[PDB]
């Protein structure tokens, strides 16, 4: 079985890139034919981004000498601008003109999960319906190959032109293949502009040094493919052969030496004996009507029957095989099957909350690992455009210029899915302890709750004043 | 190797034989043709007394029910090394695509394939209704003569006795011979389709030329059929009562081409004669496990790995089309 | 089975180095083909570093005579500088220009887990986008071999040039092999500069004296390889042979002496008997249609059948074999399988919290053992650069110079993953007891909580004043 | 365009059957003219000269 | 089945014919060789007057441009059932691996393959420059004689008239015959490579043995070529002006082995004679859809599923190497 | 090591070409000695006896 799937013995990058197309193609096959990939990407979406992905700008006020109040007001301005620019209802923020920021993050994270890499391009849109002429078009991974599909070279390696030190200079984007009859032409695309401008945002997780591509799926999913095939076929055979039945006719006849002599005489010159016996047996079956049930017994003149003696008859064991292996690959691939297909077998209280909190912290890990890159890159490009357009005003006491301290000025964090609910009592006792001991700040409280302290305080002011005015109890 | 559904033609233009006389298709799940199995004409007269009803009526047991269908499975290559048929200036950039070249070349290949089986089927048809005998034959295959049973009065000859060539080119009227051969045809004749020189010496008689009506006088859908297949069927006109047609179709054999029709022949019969298109088993594992063992045709596109590591288009069929009533047509060789 | 894997009887270093390439290559094979290594490295990442790795500078104020307040303010300055330098959004802190500090620690810890060693190099970047011209390029372990792949020598031993006493002087870095056709050339690299500058940070855990390389994985994982193979093959055979069926034809015939005489006469000169019998049986099977189901019975003329009598039919036992061995190697390799593939079988409350606290303390062990080295080395290099650039001001009353007391001045600790959550009630009763009895300090409280006392106090001030101003309840 | 194969397996690969002579020079004809706007042209009857 | 890139040899050791006289490779995207298409020698003298310039100069239309390249595609199995060539004690544990055994056995198989095509190409070369005729032949294939056009004075024989065997073994000098055959060679001859006994009776003359210089006196890279292929080319030494070589190469045919060279033959010509290596189409679907229709060689490793369910290494080529000037070498059969 | 196949299909399977004589007895030589520590040995010059 190791024949149809073969690992070379070498560093992972040189063991994957030669068989990149086959592994990725069979990955496409399984993610299309199989529901597990859809469920996994959907849960990753709903744990990492969830409803939305919220920007929070925190310029390094302490290091830059900027006042915290000026930083906070400038952040208010940039947050209002960014939310109003992102909430465009006409899907107009993409060059394809059919994806908002939500689906920017969606397709980016999905493709960085599947192929391990995502490709964003900051292009200059001309549609004047918005103040900001920068859109972000996502680039397929099929596009990145060496110019004219040539094999890897000295410095042109699977489509990326690098130096001897590996520094990613640029890329050869092959032309799109949709419809299925466009030819591919390779075009030069630099990774970033010299001034720090993020033109081609290439975010991938390298497992080792010098690696150019991300992680796969199929190269650990062939075994589900062939287990589902084998369980499927074995259930089919079991079902079809629980009551397969042979309906033949035998007789006494069979006078050993006499039967053999009759057969030999028929073979030599006395076939009339066989013809007469066949006629008698045909008359037998047409005067009997030899019929078993609703159907006719298949015509068998005496002396021939099937021997449907069977193989071993122990239990198939597939039960504990499949539970063990589903277990196995479930906290292999990472998301547990007791919800990837939802068993409720013997699961208990500590079971539930321990599994939930470890899995949720681990999704927080993946979120902070493979979402903040895209978030910061897009925010940096948008903030550069805003500074170009003088939408928001930089602090006058800027210790470093915007172009010099884009990292310092464009320092930001992002908020993923909403408020976690698992037990209730858990979150509420945590909340009461934090609010009584002061062990929670504005920033981490809002991180835990998916809200904002400024708005909760303003709305509590509104709550109290409306209760006082209408006669309610604050 | 492209899927089965890539078999779209909408091009059914057989020369008025398999579409007009031989509509009666019977693809089977079994190898041979079993004329006893086909109901054909049903025992169709007797009633029962007004007290109770009678016995059970069956398919009335055809005497001969065993002939070998012409299981024809040819193939070709669609190797993307050719420049193809370029319809005038529809963006040859897609021809430059191997995908579009390969798909429309499998289109071209397969259409050649069914028109090949159609032309061999038309040779079978012309043998059938010209002598009642068909030669199920081929190398590495025994020649089976499949006979519908054409009678002797259906094979009577014009050269016997007095020939139309050996007659008065001005005063003699071959209409007398027309009803003479039509009477023993088990029905009415309404098409007098000739081979070219046969119609030539037919019309050489004056009586023919001032008896025939060149006008449309559109009788039936045969004018529509001629407008469709303006290639080799030629609607000469009306002979008054009967329609005059000429077939000059040609088959292009292994090294040469020649007409389907013999030198001077005729078949007198109806346009609604009953023609059977019994079809045998299709010997393709794909066909059996998807249930196309009983069908008309089967295409496929498929790759060979190994010695002939290539990719081909394969067409499979098994027709054994015949005529239900060989006595329906009188077959005459002319002067 | 001991044939394809062979231990010599000798000290571990001389028992591993001769078979270094084969063991490491099969380790690559299993970490690429198998999901367990990916899950283990991911959990090690999320337990050791987690979200981030936080620096805290504590110069030995008491020993150096430095005031604690001056030390704390100087630490504030260096922490602001280090966070703003580390938060670079363009991935520019590496020579490869594609990894931030997070992935510095990520690749370092991953490679120090796999090969037991990690190789960092402090190089002088020329990119002027940042104030600090020092980057840190990580060096592959394949690079360290003797000059031109020569075998171990007197003092040149597997690429490291040492003295008789073993002191690691320098290294022979072979040239990179990506693309797969660059030749290797060996270049000299000293371990550290004489002035204490950390040029080539070589952090590895030696199991014994004189050992040069770290620990492996495959040399304890071959047994999972071959157990997964054997369970896979045995399930395949079990599935395919639960209903394998022989469809032959026998008959009565068989007149012993007569059949033998007929066969002998056929062998000598009377093959016409066999031809006649074969013709009769062919007519038999073509007049019967001997057909069992949807398929034709394979053609067997009488007198020959398969004897598919089986082997023993006891239960395979693989169930308790595999549970025992998964158990076994699970708290062998160290991380328990009841989460490396997530069983919830009969697991209880004391089960959960005892296992969780012991495993988490043990990850705290690994963190403090294999992360603080890299953290302190990188911090020392960065602080030396900062002192060169006069970014932060050293205390004026320095009892020892910076170059003399780099260890004393650059004394630091680091914070790994965020706030542990397992039970809730546990952490909250611990917190209330510590805050009532005063049994927790600033430093260990912030270690337990993943926060900072200064910022929690400042934000509590902000909390109270905003509640007072807006009308809320402090 | 004649041969078939036995009802067990299929035969070899059929090609373009190698024409004996495959080398002649096409008549590459490239003429030209001038369309210098100095002539009075073909005037189709009275379509607005 | 392993990828195409697993075709690394760095072993090009052809016996001084395809590497020294026949460097002039022309792989085509078209089946045959079209000598009219090859520019060959260019019309290379005429200028134009100092007023304007003349007409367009083309590839000067070779008279004969149609021969069939030797499309050779053999194969073998690399079934991991053998113990292989074990180079001395490089860890037979990897041979115990099916992966390493299979990869180095495809190495061994394919190297046998290109040395097979190389040895058949060397037989083509020896036929070519020994008679000007090459037999493009094989069973189930018509024998095409491919003639460069070797002239009669290039086929003049030593046995005609007086034989060197029928001469004084002590005083006769065959140098006179050397320039006699060299004059009508359309150039200077600088290698006198013999077959073994041919050189034997050549050197039997004393004048030869005190005229030849056994010393190195390294003239060119031919000494380097001999050091490379120390197998069957033997640098006898200097005959003074000219180099003396002997080729004793042998081909191991279906059941027996025998020398490439006939009994006593010679070709007089230059070391820089122009040799064409025209290459035909490569009939492999892989080769066409990846553009290796115009190349030298094509390997592949590939699995057959079904009846011959196995795995093979397949090598495909199509050489039709010839000599541009057959008159460049005078071919003489010796005494 | 000579024959090729026609440019339509490929030929049969080639084997190890069946050596006529394939049965001789290898010289299985297994000698031994004693290394009894009763001798003074080969003393390479003055490497610390």
C61 neighbors C248 (Cβ within 8 angstroms): no
Q: Are strands A168-173 and A187-190 parallel, antiparallel or unpaired?
A: antiparallel
The residues, any chain, with a CB within 8 Å of residue C441's CB and separated by 6 or more, are none
Tell whether A9 lies on the interface with E, counting CB pairs under 8 A. Answer: yes
Chains B and E form CB pairs within 8 A to the count of 22
Q: Which of E115, E286, B309, E282 is nearest to F10 (CA)?
A: B309
A113 neighbors A366 (Cβ within 8 angstroms): no
Experimental determination technique? cryo-EM
Shortest distance between the Cα of B53 and any Cα of chain D, in A, equals: 51
A to F contact (≥3 Cβ pairs closer than 8 Å): no
Peptide bond into B230 cis (omega under 30): no
A36 neighbors A399 (Cβ within 8 angstroms): no
Q: Which of D3, D7, D13 sits opposite B310 (nearest CB)?
A: D13
Structure tokens at A117: 């890499």
How big is chain F by its Cα radius of gyration, in Å? 29
C419 neighbors C161 (Cβ within 8 angstroms): no
C374 neighbors C105 (Cβ within 8 angstroms): yes
The residues, any chain, with a CB within 8 Å of residue E124's CB and separated by 6 or more, are E70, E134, E319, E321
Structure tokens at B187: 């029905």
CB contact under 8 A, D18 and E31: yes
Shortest distance between the Cα of B254 and any Cα of chain D, in A, equals: 6
User: Considering only the top CATH level, what class is E152-274+326-333?
Assistant: alpha beta
Measured CA to CA in angstroms, residue B207 lies from B169, B176, B240, B333 at distances of 9, 11, 12, 21
**E303 neighbourhood in chain B, CB within 8 Å:** 305
Structure tokens at A339: 């919800």
CA distance C59 to C410: 6
Q: Which of A155, A160, A122, A168 is nearest to A143 (CA)?
A: A160
Shortest CA distance from E76: residue in chain B: B307
**In angstroms, how far is the first alpha carbon of chain B from the final one?**
54
The residues, any chain, with a CB within 8 Å of residue B181's CB and separated by 6 or more, are B156, B266, B268, B330, B332
CB contact under 8 A, E65 and D21: no
Altogether, the residues listed in chain E come to a count of 335
**C347 neighbourhood in chain A, CB within 8 Å:** 348, 350-351
Neighbouring chains to B with at least 3 Cβ pairs closer than 8 Å: A, D, E, F
Reduced to 3 states (helix: H, G, I; strand: E, B; else coil), residue E146 is strand
- B180 burial (CB, 10 Å; 0-12 / 13-18 / 19+) is middle
Tell whether A151 lies on the interface with E, counting CB pairs under 8 A. Answer: yes
CA distance C89 to A376: 7
Reduced to 3 states (helix: H, G, I; strand: E, B; else coil), residue B194 is strand
CB contact under 8 A, A18 and E5: yes
Structure tokens at E295: 């190349």
DSSP B81-92: TS-----TTS-T
Helix, strand, coil abundance in chain E, percent, nearest 5: 25, 20, 55
CA distance C159 to C146: 4
E interface residues, D as partner, C-beta within 8 Å:
31-32, 34, 36, 65-66, 283, 307
B interface residues, F as partner, C-beta within 8 Å:
307-308
CA distance E169 to A386: 103
Q: Which of C76, C72, C124 is nearest to C389 (CA)?
A: C124
DSSP H or E run through B142: strand B141-147
Neighbouring chains to D with at least 3 Cβ pairs closer than 8 Å: B, E, F
Reduced to 3 states (helix: H, G, I; strand: E, B; else coil), residue A443 is helix
Q: Which of B276, B230, B315, B322 is nearest to B38 (CA)?
A: B276
Suggest the residue from C343, C349, C350, C355 to mutate for an interface test with chain A (most A CBs closer than 10 A). Answer: C343
Q: What are phi and psi of E244, to 5 degrees?
A: -110, 120
Shortest CA distance from F6: residue in chain D: D12
Shortest distance between the Cα of F11 and any Cα of chain B, in A, equals: 9
Q: Are strands E24-27 and E275-279 parallel, antiparallel or unpaired?
A: parallel
Chains A and C form CB pairs within 8 A to the count of 335
With tokens 């031109």, the residue in question is: C148
Structure tokens at A24: 């990725």
Measured CA to CA in angstroms, residue E186 lies from B330, E178, E181, E334 at distances of 82, 14, 11, 21
CA distance A44 to A39: 8
Q: Which of E284, E289, E302 sits opposite B98 (nearest CB)?
A: E289
Q: Which of C138, C257, C240 is nearest to C189 (CA)?
A: C138
Measured CA to CA in angstroms, residue A359 lies from A336, A422, C453 at distances of 8, 12, 29
**A18 neighbourhood in chain E, CB within 8 Å:** 3, 5
CB contact under 8 A, A260 and C272: no
Q: Which of C453, C180, C223, C435 is nearest to C328 (CA)?
A: C223
Q: Which of E65, E283, E307 sits opposite D23 (nearest CB)?
A: E65
With tokens 């840190």, the residue in question is: C136
**A9 neighbourhood in chain E, CB within 8 Å:** 99
Shortest CA distance from E310: residue in chain A: A3
DSSP B38-78: S--S--------SSS----------S---B----B--EEE-
Q: Alpha helix locations (H) across C187-243?
A: 222-241
Q: Which of B9, B282, B273 is nearest to B125 (CA)?
A: B273
The residues, any chain, with a CB within 8 Å of residue A452's CB and separated by 6 or more, are A446
The residues, any chain, with a CB within 8 Å of residue E145's CB and separated by 6 or more, are E133, E134, E135, E136
Q: Which of B319, B245, B234 is nearest to B275 (CA)?
A: B319
CA distance E230 to E228: 6
Neighbouring chains to F with at least 3 Cβ pairs closer than 8 Å: B, D, E
B interface residues, E as partner, C-beta within 8 Å:
79-81, 98, 303, 305-306, 309-311
Structure tokens at E193: 């490579």
Q: Residue A176 gets which letter from DSSP? A: P
Helices C257-268 & C271-287 angle (0-180, nearest 10): 110
Peptide bond into C182 cis (omega under 30): no
Cβ within 8 Å of C, A 378-407: 380, 404, 406-407
B209 neighbors B203 (Cβ within 8 angstroms): yes
C-alpha angle with apex C350: C345 to C353, nearest 5 degrees? 95
CA distance C266 to C244: 35
Give the residues across from E310 on adjacent strands. E304
Structure tokens at D48: 């607005």
**F1 neighbourhood in chain E, CB within 8 Å:** 112, 115-116, 119, 252
E to D contact (≥3 Cβ pairs closer than 8 Å): yes
Measured CA to CA in angstroms, residue C179 lies from A12, C140, C173, E314 at distances of 13, 14, 17, 28
Q: Å resolution of this model?
A: 5.6
CA distance A31 to A25: 10
Peptide bond into A179 cis (omega under 30): yes
Q: Alpha helix locations (H) across C288-401?
A: 318-333, 337-340, 349-370, 372-389
How big is chain E by its Cα radius of gyration, in Å? 24
Side-chain half-sphere CA neighbours of F15 within 13 A? 3
DSSP H or E run through C465: helix C453-470
**Long-range CB contact pairs, A454-460, < 8 A, 24+:** A457/C466, A457/C467, A457/C470, A457/C472, A458/C470, A460/C470, A460/C471, A460/C472
Q: Alpha helix locations (H) across A213-270?
A: 222-241, 257-268
Q: Residue B33 gets which letter from DSSP? A: B
**F9 neighbourhood in chain B, CB within 8 Å:** 307-308
Shortest CA distance from B100: residue in chain A: A181
Q: Which of A7, A310, A350 sits opposite C352 (nearest CB)?
A: A350
E319 neighbors E312 (Cβ within 8 angstroms): no
Structure tokens at C284: 């038999």
Tell whether A388 lies on the interface with B, counting CB pairs under 8 A. Answer: no
Chains B and D form CB pairs within 8 A to the count of 17
Measured CA to CA in angstroms, residue E161 lies from A38, E165, E168, E171, E200 at distances of 92, 12, 15, 18, 20
CA distance A91 to A62: 38
B50 neighbors B26 (Cβ within 8 angstroms): no
Virtual CA dihedral for E75, E81, E83, E87, nearest 10 degrees? Answer: 50
Structure tokens at C434: 């510590």
**E250 neighbourhood in chain F, CB within 8 Å:** none
C-alpha angle with apex E328: E325 to E329, nearest 5 degrees? 125
CA distance A413 to A367: 12
A303 neighbors A250 (Cβ within 8 angstroms): yes
CB atoms within 10 A of CB A245: 9
CA distance A434 to A2: 55
E324 neighbors E306 (Cβ within 8 angstroms): no
CA distance B325 to D42: 68
CA distance B19 to B14: 7
DSSP H or E run through C187: strand C187-190
Shortest CA distance from E31: residue in chain D: D18
Shortest distance between the Cα of D45 and any Cα of chain E, in A, equals: 46
DSSP H or E run through B332: strand B330-333
C-alpha angle with apex B311: B307 to B317, nearest 5 degrees? 110
CB contact under 8 A, E312 and B305: no
B42 neighbors B60 (Cβ within 8 angstroms): yes
Structure tokens at C260: 């033998």
Neighbouring chains to E with at least 3 Cβ pairs closer than 8 Å: A, B, D, F
Shortest distance between the Cα of D3 and any Cα of chain F, in A, equals: 16
**E105 neighbourhood in chain F, CB within 8 Å:** none
Tell whether C239 lies on the interface with A, counting CB pairs under 8 A. Answer: yes
Give the residues across from E258 on adjacent strands. E251
Number of H helices, E strands in chain B: 7, 14
Q: Which of B56, B86, B99, B75 is nearest to B299 (CA)?
A: B75
**D4 neighbourhood in chain B, CB within 8 Å:** 73-74, 138, 140
Measured CA to CA in angstroms, residue C332 lies from C26, C38, C46, C111, E263 at distances of 19, 17, 20, 20, 77
D to C contact (≥3 Cβ pairs closer than 8 Å): no
Cβ within 8 Å of A, B 95-114: 96-97, 99-100
Q: Which of E138, E19, E6 is nearest to E69 (CA)?
A: E138
Q: Which of B325, B180, B201, B219 is nearest to B265 (CA)?
A: B201
B311 neighbors B304 (Cβ within 8 angstroms): yes
């Amino acid at each position: 079985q190791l024949r149809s799937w073969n690992p070379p013995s070498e560093s992972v990058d040189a063991a994957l890139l030669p068989n990149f197309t086959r592994g990725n193609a069979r990955a496409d096959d399984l993610v299309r034919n199989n529901g597990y990939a859809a469920n996994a990407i959907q849960l990753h979406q709903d744990h990492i981004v969830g409803s939305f992905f919220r920007l929070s700008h925190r310029p390094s006020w302490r290091y830059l000498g900027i006042g915290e109040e000026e930083a906070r007001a400038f952040s208010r301005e940039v947050e209002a601008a960014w939310k109003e620019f992102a909430e465009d209802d006409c899907c107009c923020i993409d060059v394809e003109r059919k994806r908002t920021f939500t689906m920017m993050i969606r397709e980016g994270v999905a493709m960085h999960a599947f192929n391990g890499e995502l490709f964003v391009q900051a292009t200059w849109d001309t549609s004047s319906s918005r103040l900001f002429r920068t859109q972000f078009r996502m680039v397929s991974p099929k596009r990145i190959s060496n110019p004219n599909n040539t094999g890897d070279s000295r410095n042109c390696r699977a489509g990326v032109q690098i130096n001897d030190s590996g520094a990613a200079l640029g890329y050869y984007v092959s032309e799109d293949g949709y419809p299925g009859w466009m030819p591919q032409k390779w075009t030069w695309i630099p990774r970033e502009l010299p001034g720090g401008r993020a033109s081609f945002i290439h975010v991938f997780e390298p497992v080792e040094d010098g690696q150019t591509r991300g992680a796969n799926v199929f190269y650990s999913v062939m075994e589900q493919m062939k287990m589902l095939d084998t369980l499927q076929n074995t259930q089919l055979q079991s079902a079809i052969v629980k009551a397969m039945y042979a309906a033949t006719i035998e007789s006494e006849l069979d006078t050993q030496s006499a039967m053999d002599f009759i057969l030999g005489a028929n073979s030599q010159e006395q076939r009339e004996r066989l013809t007469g016996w066949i006629g008698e047996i045909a008359a037998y079956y047409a005067a009997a009507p030899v019929r078993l049930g609703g159907a006719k017994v298949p015509h068998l003149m005496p002396g021939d029957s099937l021997n449907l003696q069977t193989a071993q008859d122990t239990d198939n064991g597939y039960s504990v095989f499949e539970q063990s292996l589903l277990r196995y690959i479930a906290a292999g691939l990472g998301v547990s099957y007791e919800q990837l297909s939802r068993n409720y077998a013997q699961m208990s209280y500590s079971t539930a909350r321990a599994s939930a909190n470890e899995s949720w912290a681990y999704f927080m890990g993946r979120r902070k690992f493979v979402a903040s890159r895209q978030a910061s890159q897009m925010f940096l490009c948008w903030l550069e455009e805003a500074i170009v357009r003088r939408v928001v005003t930089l602090p006058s006491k800027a210790r470093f210029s915007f172009q010099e301290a884009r990292s310092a000025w464009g320092n930001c964090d992002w908020i993923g899915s909403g408020r976690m609910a698992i037990d209730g009592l858990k979150e509420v006792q945590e909340a009461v302890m934090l609010i009584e001991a002061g062990l929670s700040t504005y920033e981490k409280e809002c991180a835990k709750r998916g809200d904002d302290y400024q708005e909760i305080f303003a709305q509590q002011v509104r709550e109290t004043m409306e209760r006082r005015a209408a006669g309610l109890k604050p | 190797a492209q899927l089965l559904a890539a078999n779209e033609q909408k091009f059914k233009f057989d020369p008025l034989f398999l579409r007009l006389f031989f509509r009666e298709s019977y693809p089977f799940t079994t190898e041979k043709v079993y004329l006893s199995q086909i109901p054909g004409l049903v025992n169709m007269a007797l009633y029962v007394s007004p007290i109770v009803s009678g016995e059970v009526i069956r398919s009335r047991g055809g005497s001969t029910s065993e002939f070998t269908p012409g299981y024809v499975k040819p193939k070709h290559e669609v190797n993307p090394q050719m420049t193809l048929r370029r319809l005038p200036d529809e963006d040859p950039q897609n021809l430059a695509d191997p995908a579009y070249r390969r798909r429309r070349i499998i289109m071209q290949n397969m259409r050649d394939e069914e028109l090949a089986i159609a032309q061999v089927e038309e040779m079978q048809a012309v043998s059938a209704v010209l002598k009642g005998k068909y030669t199920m034959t081929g190398e590495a295959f025994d020649p089976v003569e499949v006979d519908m049973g054409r009678s002797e009065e259906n094979n009577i000859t014009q050269s016997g006795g007095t020939e139309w060539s050996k007659r008065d080119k001005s005063t003699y009227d071959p209409t007398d011979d027309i009803e003479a051969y039509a009477l023993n045809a088990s029905g009415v004749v309404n098409i007098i389709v000739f081979d070219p020189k046969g119609w030539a010496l037919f019309r050489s008689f004056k009586a023919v030329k001032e008896k025939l009506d060149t006008r449309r006088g559109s009788n039936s859908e045969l004018e529509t059929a001629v407008k469709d297949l303006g290639k080799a069927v030629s609607y000469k006109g009306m002979y008054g009562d009967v329609a005059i047609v000429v077939y000059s179709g040609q088959y292009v054999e292994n090294g040469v081409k020649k007409n389907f029709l013999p030198d001077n022949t005729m078949v007198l019969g109806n346009t609604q004669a009953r023609g059977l298109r019994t079809y045998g088993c299709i010997q393709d594992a794909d066909a059996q496990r998807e249930g196309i063992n009983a069908s008309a045709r089967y295409p496929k596109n498929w790759v060979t790995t190994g010695d002939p590591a290539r990719e081909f288009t394969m067409i499979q069929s098994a027709p054994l089309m015949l005529l239900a009533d060989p006595d329906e047509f009188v077959s005459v060789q002319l002067a």
